[PDB]
């Protein structure tokens, strides 16, 4: 028995229906065979010990789910999922990771298999902290978020939560993976949007630490306060405020 929750009820059906919905919405993805996507997804973790998963296991899925996102329209986020997706819900030329096909398919789901059999484990799955970090879910997110960050160019944006004790956290997906996978060739600038929940937060010690990381990687850093998130979303919806 693992410590984490088991695979989400109706995981196979949910992934397939998400794929059908996404490929209907996006005409550039209507080529995608959703059965093949599911087979590739399932093939990454079925009949495998769920502490023994690697990025290689997900390669067939990455090939089938590959997508050209306009590299100058990428929004990264850390600990502020809610507002990030509300933003891209309105500003529809922009993409977070969960607005890509692969990110859309997996968002809010858990899954794992087992060594002995070809069955999905609905009982329990490894928790990253208590059991093992090389589990089907964590390895999936590590793989797709690295590729997404590698794809970015020009000005990459990151939404951060100004109400947290650490606005930027080095130990997050953003702070340990995405930030080291932005390519200095492609990416001229990382612009942080600090969301307030009020005074300028762009000199916060953790923002200074983010700046330091970014500069050391030969990318320019810029920081902006969003002092009133409501007004911000209203003004993106109707610019004429």
């Amino acid at each position: 028995t693992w410590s984490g929750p088991g695979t989400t009820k109706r995981f196979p059906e949910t992934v397939l229906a998400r794929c059908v919905k996404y490929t209907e919405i996006h005409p550039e993805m209507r080529h995608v065979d959703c059965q093949s996507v599911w087979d590739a997804f399932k093939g990454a973790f079925i009949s495998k010990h769920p502490c023994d998963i690697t990025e290689e296991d997900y390669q067939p899925l990455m090939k089938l789910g590959t997508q050209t996102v306009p590299c100058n329209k990428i929004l990264l986020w850390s600990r502020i999922k809610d507002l990030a997706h509300q933003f891209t819900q309105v500003q529809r030329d922009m993409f977070t990771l969960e607005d890509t096909l692969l990110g859309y398919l997996a968002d809010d789901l858990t899954w794992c298999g087992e060594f002995d059999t070809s069955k999905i484990n609905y009982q329990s799955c490894p928790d990253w902290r208590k059991d093992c970090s090389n589990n089907p879910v964590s390895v999936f997110w590590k793989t797709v978020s690295r590729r997404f960050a590698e794809a970015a160019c020009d000005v990459v944006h990151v939404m951060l939560d100004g109400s947290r004790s650490k606005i930027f956290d080095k130990d997050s997906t953003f702070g340990s993976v995405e930030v080291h996978n932005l390519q200095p060739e492609k990416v001229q600038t990382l612009e942080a949007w600090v969301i307030h929940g009020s005074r300028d937060l762009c000199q916060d010690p953790t923002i200074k630490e983010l700046e330091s990381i970014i500069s050391k990687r030969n990318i320019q850093f810029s920081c902006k306060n969003i002092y009133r998130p409501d007004k911000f979303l209203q003004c993106v919806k109707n610019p004429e405020c």
Partner: nanobody
Amino acid sequence: DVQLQESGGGLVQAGHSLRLSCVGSGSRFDNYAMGWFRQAPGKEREFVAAISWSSGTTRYLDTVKGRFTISRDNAKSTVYLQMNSLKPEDTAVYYCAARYQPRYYDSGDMDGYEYDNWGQGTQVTVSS
């Protein structure tokens, strides 16, 4: 809420083409499913064509399939109706309409839209 403005109507001979345009302002164009309707004189308004925000889904009136094509350009806040092989029975005022649509819409819901933003119309007359 979005303000709509049609143009490109005109007087044309049967068998010829016209391209209608409709520009939106106010709220972001890419938040709206767009529809073209038409009303001939003394007749009721009827649906002609529609398109999702993403251009992933279109719908057409049966009698215009393979003659009319709907499309859009969200960066220009514009929707188009390319009308080929026009017939005298295509004579009407053509109206552009908008309906808020989620980014992640169900294609099923494209059949039941009541459109709540309307342009003033563009006159199309087809002669013979």
